[PDB]
């Protein structure tokens, strides 16, 4: 039975280079020759304790493309949740007696991990947990990178924005640090720098990384430009405004980029990427968003199906 069969998908760190490649290989196949009844008769719980429409819609669409049923809920906006009542341990203990798999998104770090200890034999997939993990978004970022660059080794990857609190850039850095020869360029405001811990891990591997203050400063040599959303709340509106101009991508900034270079963004973009970029062949965030479907179909197929016949 496949390596991922019945496993829980909690943190990217629990996945080896071999696992990532297995998911990505399956995703490409599901994209080529679709299997609409593969999961027929399964019932999956879409448990969004934290609301997220883009992510819920994508996971659920994934569930539907494979023939599975979906039960679930979203935004548990309890008026001042001092105690929503039931413990999460209890909720999972109950839900795991109804369904065949649980996809959950929760506000607190470690929630999907805890769930794992009460779901019994039912696999639980992490759809986001606090400021910790969001593995499905990474599987989608890597699949989009491999699809467009043809490889996950020897790439010049730039990560721009809120490198400090962006849970996704943290994960992408760890996943790609599992492949060889990748060079990282970190473009972030002084107050939102890549955490030391990530730099530390990188150095151990003997991976190269450099810190840049401007994007055009490294424009010419990047294959992937991964922009993230700088949240103004993390900043003062004056200081925000003071640094803004330094990290917003406009089509002009791309005039020196390579033919193969693509711009990714977990979305939503808003200030950071001008619409004029949408029209260039380097824009790949919407295509990246579509690949979530195959990355997600793949993951579910592998976990819920003894052997993938493709």
């Amino acid at each position: 039975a496949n390596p991922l069969y019945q496993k829980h998908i909690i943190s990217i760190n629990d996945l080896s280079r071999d696992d990532l490649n297995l998911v990505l290989a399956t995703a490409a196949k599901l994209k080529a020759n679709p299997q609409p009844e593969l999961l027929k008769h399964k019932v999956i719980a879409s448990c969004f304790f934290e609301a997220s429409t883009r992510t819920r819609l994508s996971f659920e669409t994934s569930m539907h493309r494979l023939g599975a049923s979906v039960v679930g809920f979203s935004d548990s906006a309890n008026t001042s949740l001092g105690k929503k009542g039931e413990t999460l341990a209890d909720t999972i203990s109950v839900i795991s007696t109804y369904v065949d798999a649980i996809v959950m998104r929760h506000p607190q770090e470690g929630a999907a991990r805890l769930a794992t200890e009460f779901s019994g034999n039912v696999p639980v997939l992490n759809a986001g947990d606090g400021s910790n993990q969001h593995p499905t978004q990474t599987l989608l970022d890597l699949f989009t990178i491999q699809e467009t660059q043809g490889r996950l080794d020897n790439l010049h990857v730039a990560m721009v924005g809120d490198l400090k609190y962006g849970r996704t850039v943290h994960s992408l850095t760890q996943a790609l640090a599992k492949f060889d020869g990748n060079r990282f360029y970190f473009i972030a405001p002084d107050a939102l720098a890549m955490p030391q811990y990530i730099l530390d891990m990188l150095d151990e591997k003997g991976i190269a990384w450099s810190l840049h203050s401007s994007i055009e400063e490294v424009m010419a040599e990047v294959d992937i430009l991964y922009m993230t959303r700088v949240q103004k709340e993390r900043l003062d509106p004056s200081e925000y405004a003071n640094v803004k101009a330094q990290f917003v991508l406009r089509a002009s900034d791309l005039h020196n980029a390579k033919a193969n270079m693509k711009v990714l963004h977990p979305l939503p973009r808003v200030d950071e990427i001008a619409t004029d970029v949408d029209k260039t062949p380097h824009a790949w965030y919407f295509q990246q968003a579509g690949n979530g479907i195959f990355a997600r179909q793949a993951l579910l197929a592998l976990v819920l199906n003894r052997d993938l016949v493709l």
């Binding site: 760190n13 413990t87 929760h106 770090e109 470690g110 929630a111 805890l114 947990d129 400021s131 910790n132």
Partner: protein, 153 residues
């Protein structure tokens, strides 16, 4: 062992003796590891004259032996301690606190948004030494804190 002073001294038949516990740590260990929850005769000695090392705490648990794993749990609180096995009134065995791999249910994740706090789960941290400083990574939120920070609680 027996603090043979002048008049009298006590001794257990066979069991464990934890000696060289730094002062003020003795009671914590009894509390934390819930060692006082047995029907066994326990003898505790607090603020004992060590002279050289200073003042020490001492614990003797009768007809009770600690697995190497249990002895290892003392590392962060009393790494200097010596755990003696006594059988037939004498020290058949002697081991010391070795740095564990994981530290269960005795610590508290300083991450306030960690799921561990409000739930029916034992905490668990992964011990990682980085030359004397010990980083402890939470099993749940996966954050890594200094042992200093976690230990204050």
């Amino acid at each position: 062992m027996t603090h043979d002073n002048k008049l009298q001294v006590e001794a257990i038949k066979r069991g464990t003796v934890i000696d060289a516990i730094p002062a003020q740590i003795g009671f914590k260990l009894l509390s934390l590891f819930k060692l006082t929850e047995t029907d066994q005769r326990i003898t505790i000695g607090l603020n004992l004259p060590s002279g050289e090392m200073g003042r020490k705490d001492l614990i003797k648990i009768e007809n009770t032996f600690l697995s190497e794993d249990q002895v290892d749990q003392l590392a962060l609180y009393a790494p200097q301690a010596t755990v003696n096995r006594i059988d037939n009134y004498e020290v058949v065995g002697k081991s010391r606190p070795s740095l564990p791999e994981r530290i269960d249910n005795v610590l508290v994740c300083p991450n306030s948004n960690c799921i561990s706090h409000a739930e029916p789960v034992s905490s668990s941290f992964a011990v990682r030494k980085r030359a004397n400083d010990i980083a402890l990574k939470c099993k749940y939120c996966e954050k890594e804190f200094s042992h200093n920070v976690v230990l204050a609680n």
